[PDB]
Structure formats: C-alpha cells, structure tokens
C-alpha cells in the first residue's frame, strides 16, 4: 500500500495538464520529432536542473516564491514575477479546464456531438467523412466544427478586436471550475491521486495502442519520427521547447518552490526531480506519438495533409481526442473517461498554480495567513473575472495571446533570474551545502555546472532569441493586429520588469552607503549582521569562482 502511494505521488506529480494539452500542439506546430530534440535537450540541461533547484530552494527555506529570496534580497522581484506569471497563467488555464468540463457534459450521450454534422452549430461547409486549400487549416470537420462553433462560438467573433460577450455555457463551466478550486483550496494547502496519477497514463496507453491501428496512423507516425532539421535552425522550435519544459515541469511559476516549502526538510528533491523529469520525457514522447497517430488518421479520413488537418492552437486536443474517441468502441464511456481525466489533471494543475500565488503572497504578508478563506476567494475570484475574457466569443484569441505571452520570454527570464540569484549571488556552493544539509549528499558536478553556467547560458540564449526572433501572433489563418502583439509584450514585460523594479526599490529603501546597500541586498536577511562587520562573501573573488 505504501509503495502504491509513493508510485501514485511521483507519477501524479510528473504529469501535468500541459503534458496532455499544450505539448501536443507545440509538437504538431513544430513538426513533431524536430520538436522532441530541443525539448529533450532543454529538459536535460535546464529543466531537470532548475526543477531540482526550485524544489531544493522551497524545501530548504520553508518559503514561497517571493519570500525564498531572503537568501538574496535583491532578487525578490523574481519571486513576485513568478507569482504574477502564475496568476496570468491561471487566467486561461481554468478556461481549458472549463472546456474539458463542457466536453464532459457533452459526453453524456450515445450520439457524441462531434461525430457528425447536422447540428445547430454546423456550418453549411461541414464535411462529414462518413457522409481543400493547401496552406490553410481545414476547420470543416465535425470535431473542429463542434469545438469552434458549438463550444467556443468563435464564428461569432471576427478577431481579438471583436471578442463578444462571455459565452454563457462556458461561463457556467468556468463558475463550476472556480468554485471547485476555491473549495479545494480554502481550508488548507495544496501539496485525488488515484485519478490524476493513473487515469492520464491509462488514457495515454489506450490512445497510443488504438491509434497505432488506425488507418493512416502510420503516416502520422512517420511524420512524427521524421526530423526536419531545417526547423532546428530557427528559433521557434527552441523557444517553444524551452517554454514547454518550464510550463510542464512547473518552474518559473513559484509552483515548485511553494510545493517544496511544505515538504519534509529531509525529503529527496534529487530523486523527485529525476523521476518527474524522466516521466515528463516519456509521457511527452508517447503523447506526441499518439497525437500524431491520430493526426495521420484524420489526414487519411479527411483526405487532407497532416500539416493542415488540425489546429496548431490550444484546442488541438479538443479535436484530436474526440476524433480518437469516435473511433473507439463504447465511445461514450471513453469520452467520459478522457474528459474526466482532463478535468482532474487540469484541476490538480490549477490548484497547484493557485497555491503558488496563495503561499507566495501569504508568506510575504502574514495578515494573509490568518485569512486563507478570504485570500483564496480573492485569488479565485480575480482569476475567474480575468478568465471571463477567454470564454467570450473571441476568447480563443485572448487565450492564444495569453498562452503566448503570460509564460514565454517572461517565464524564461524568471527562471534565468532564479538560476543567477541562487547560483551566482547566493552561491552555488552554499546551495550545495544546503542540499547536503537536507539530503546528506552534496549535489554533483553536473548539477552545479548546470545551475551556474549551462542552464543560465541556454536560458539567456532562448530569452534573447525570443525577443530578437519574435514572430507576430497568429491563430490558424487569423493574424492578430499589431496592437495585440504590443499588448502581449506588455503582459510579458509586466512580470519581467518586477525584477529590476524590485532591485531599484530595495537599493533606494536600504540605508547606508552604496556598498552597504549592495551588501544588504546580496547578503541573506539573517546574515545582515555581517554587513556591519565587512564580511560579505560576494565582495571576494573566491565566491564567484566557486563551482
């Protein structure tokens, strides 16, 4: 029984709604196998290392994302930035949960709404394969039509300039999602696993085993296991891979720091990082393989090419997995199972992301610790109100903007600043001593080198290319207006600037000379007596040569 509990905990932690919803369309958008190379490389060299770093930071300091920067006070803007990023991401994560809930409610029938045309939401162009412009998305399949017109009601929106009013069915589903979130978070800290640690893998295995047998699935498997190396010479695949690594692993959100701050101090964060990263890699490879088998099946059913058969946006799984369920026997049972799985995964991830904000901000302000019901209500209600934009008629455009900018360059920059503040200013040797205190072994050279040089360097590379090789935002054949790009960059900068803003604020608020202020800002808050003694390690070269 205890072994089963450990297995469930580790595999449930490894699996995120990102792995099952977001990875498929970044994988499809970037050709598949070509996406898996930068993704695996980034996992190894920055994601597992920084996942480990965040776990150890939270578990050693017993703090959330913001207050963990008592070890280097100048870097608390980083914690504030990751909290803001987590809030932004919750503004559209719960809308994907609301889509899952809508699809589950729609799954309680013997005639699934996405199998045929002839519904009230179907356009005259709906083409039922059972009874095309090359560089264009199909959009006329029964599943694509169900999603876009009967779920999103996107046909009633011309663009992000005309998003319309919140669709009321999605409004009720979002209300249910956020009420469940509140009452799952209001009386205690986030830290069901017989659903969120077993159903994702059973569903993934069923999809893989069934899809490999679908007609045309071989073509999708060949497209997936085909590396288009020309894609690897552009920055899009690398940026997408780095962002997906940090999105699925939970770094750059304060989620890992807050989660670990509630762990036992002697818990093995190294084994946790290894298990989570290995399972993330395996469930991403298998998730891509299954979604590309389905895509190769739809390219054969719809007689369209794989690169044009489905969306490259957020709702790709809400077309692909309904398409796979339709081919399964007892498709209603499988629809319910899949959308219960999606709802559970999303609710778990959203509770973790909300606890990131709640813990990070209640650790910083202790008045908030005495009011968890009220502060949790504030967070959930704000998230609901600002997610109301992504359940409008043109809410897919708002969701695309957010899924591009809330945690993109901003999340990469936040994890880069975390890595720098921990491994250069606090000291990677000091951090290794902390990890030895927790676990009894000191981190190896691979981890310290990654923390100090490799993960920071690759993160800086992706951050720079994300800015200089930025591509204007589009949703399928829809090109967002330029002001939408400026708004998205404003959303990214809103968290990115908290770092320098907090550095300036901390410098100006501190008293003393310039060097006294610098020493107080780089020394841990519990060692500030050393500043008066002129005993700052960061003012010596041996500190910065440390590895």
């Amino acid at each position, epitope marked *: 029984g205890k072994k089963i509990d450990f297995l469930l905990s580790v595999v449930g932690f490894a699996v995120d709604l990102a792995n099952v919803w977001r990875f498929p369309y970044l994988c499809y958008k970037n050709g598949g196998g070509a996406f898996l190379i930068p993704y695996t490389l980034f996992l190894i060299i920055a994601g597992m290392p920084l996942f480990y770093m965040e776990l150890a930071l939270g578990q050693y300091n017993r703090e959330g994302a913001a207050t963990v920067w008592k070890i280097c006070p100048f870097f608390k803007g980083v914690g504030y930035a990751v909290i803001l990023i987590a809030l932004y991401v919750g503004f559209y994560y719960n809308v994907i949960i609301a889509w899952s809930l809508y699809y589950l409610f729609s799954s309680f029938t013997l005639n699934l709404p996405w199998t045929d045309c002839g519904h009230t939401w179907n356009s005259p162009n709906c083409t039922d394969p059972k009874l095309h412009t090359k560089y264009s998305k199909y959009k006329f399949t029964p599943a694509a039509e169900f999603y876009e017109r009967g779920v999103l009601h996107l046909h009633e929106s011309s663009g992000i300039h005309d998003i319309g009013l919140p669709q009321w069915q999605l409004l009720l589903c979002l209300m249910v999602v956020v009420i469940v979130l509140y009452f799952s978070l209001w009386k205690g800290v986030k830290t069901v696993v017989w659903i969120t640690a077993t159903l994702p893998y059973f569903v993934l295995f069923v999809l893989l085993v069934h899809g490999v047998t679908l007609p045309g699935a071989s073509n999708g498997i060949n497209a997936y296991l085909h590396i288009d190396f020309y894609r690897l010479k552009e920055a899009t695949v690398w940026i997408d891979a780095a962002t997906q690594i940090f999105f699925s692993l939970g770094a750059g959100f304060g989620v890992l720091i807050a989660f670990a*701050s*509630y762990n036992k*101090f002697d818990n093995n964060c190294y084994r946790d990082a290894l298990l989570t990263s290995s399972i993330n890699c395996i469930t991403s490879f298998v998730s891509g393989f299954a979604i590309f088998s389905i895509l190769g099946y739809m390219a054969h059913e719809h007689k369209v090419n794989i690169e044009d058969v489905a969306t490259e946006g957020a709702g790709l799984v809400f077309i692909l997995y309904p398409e796979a369920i339709s081919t399964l026997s007892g498709s209603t049972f499988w629809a319910v199972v899949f959308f219960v799985m999606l709802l559970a995964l999303g609710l778990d991830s959203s509770m973790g992301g909300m606890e990131a904000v709640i813990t990070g901000l209640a650790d910083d302000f202790q008045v908030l610790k005495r009011h968890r019901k009220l502060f949790t209500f504030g967070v959930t209600f704000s998230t609901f109100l600002l997610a109301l934009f992504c359940i409008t008629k043109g809410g897919i455009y708002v969701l695309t903007l957010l899924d591009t900018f809330a945690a993109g360059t901003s999340i990469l920059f936040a994890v880069l600043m975390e890595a720098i503040g921990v491994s250069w200013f606090y000291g990677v040797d000091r951090f290794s001593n902390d990890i030895q205190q927790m676990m009894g072994f000191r981190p190896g050279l691979y981890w310290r080198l990654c923390w100090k040089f490799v993960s920071p360097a690759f993160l800086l590379f992706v951050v720079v290319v994300s800015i200089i090789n930025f591509k204007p935002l589009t949703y399928d054949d829809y090109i967002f207006p330029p002001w939408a790009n400026w708004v998205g960059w404003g959303i990214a900068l809103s968290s990115m600037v908290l770092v320098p803003i907090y550095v300036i604020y901390k410098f100006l608020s501190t008293q003393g000379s310039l060097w006294e202020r610098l020493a107080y800002g780089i020394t841990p808050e519990n*060692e500030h007596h050393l500043v008066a003694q002129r005993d700052i390690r960061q003012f010596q070269l041996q500190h910065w040569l440390a590895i």
Partner: nanobody, 119 residues
Framework: EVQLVESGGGLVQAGGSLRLSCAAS????????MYWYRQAPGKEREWVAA???????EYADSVKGRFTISRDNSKNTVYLQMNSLKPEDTAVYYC??????????????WGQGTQVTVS
C-alpha cells in the same frame, strides 16, 4: 533526524542568570520557528519564548524583560538567556521546533528538556 538537545540547566540562586542552549540537528534553526516551553512541577507546559524564521522574538508575559531568546545560525543553536530568575522559574525548560508559518504544521519536535531550579 530532527533532534533537539537542551543544555545549561542547574541550580541557581534567586535573581541569578542562566543561559539555556538548544543544540538543534536535522534542520536549520534559521528557517524554522524555535520555541521555549517550561513545565513547572505539577503544572502544564507553559510557553516561554519563540524566535521565528525572520528572527522576530516573542515572550510570555511571565518572562517579558527577563528572558531573551536568541539563535546562532552558524551553530544551529537556540539560546534562552534567563535573567533575574525568580523562585517561580523552576521548571523543565523544553525546546520546540515548528515549521515556518501557520500553514506549515508538520514539525512539532521537542527536546528531552533541561531542568532549571531556582533556590
């Protein structure tokens, strides 16, 4: 792993001074809340002093202005400098560790206790 070993107790004349030590192990006293309790003979456990992860110290009204709680993060030791010891201060002084904050409630380790007797 979490081990608290109190020391520094013993006989002391009324109005004297004693410094208790709590050699903590298995955790950093800097990131955890450290408490001092005392169980007088025939009474219940009375909370005496608390130093929090931030270094903020709280004292019971019965010891305010007399007992001082401090910690040595380098030594991972918590001290209780007890001054002007009244005969009523005789008790077994226990050192307690709690996790940082009210939402972290999985640490409540105690020491064996150090006996303080004021004659």
């Amino acid at each position: 792993e979490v081990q608290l070993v109190e020391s520094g107790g013993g006989l002391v004349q009324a109005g004297g001074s004693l410094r208790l030590s709590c050699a903590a192990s298995g955790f950093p006293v800097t990131n955890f809340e450290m408490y001092w309790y005392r169980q007088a003979p025939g009474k219940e456990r009375e909370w005496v002093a608390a130093i929090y992860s931030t270094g903020i110290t709280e004292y019971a009204d019965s010891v305010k202005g007399r007992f001082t709680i401090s910690r040595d993060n380098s030594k991972n030791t918590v001290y209780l400098q007890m001054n002007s010891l009244k005969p009523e201060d005789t008790a077994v002084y226990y050192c307690n560790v709690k996790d940082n904050g009210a939402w972290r409630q999985n640490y409540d380790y105690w020491g064996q206790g150090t006996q303080v007797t004021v004659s």
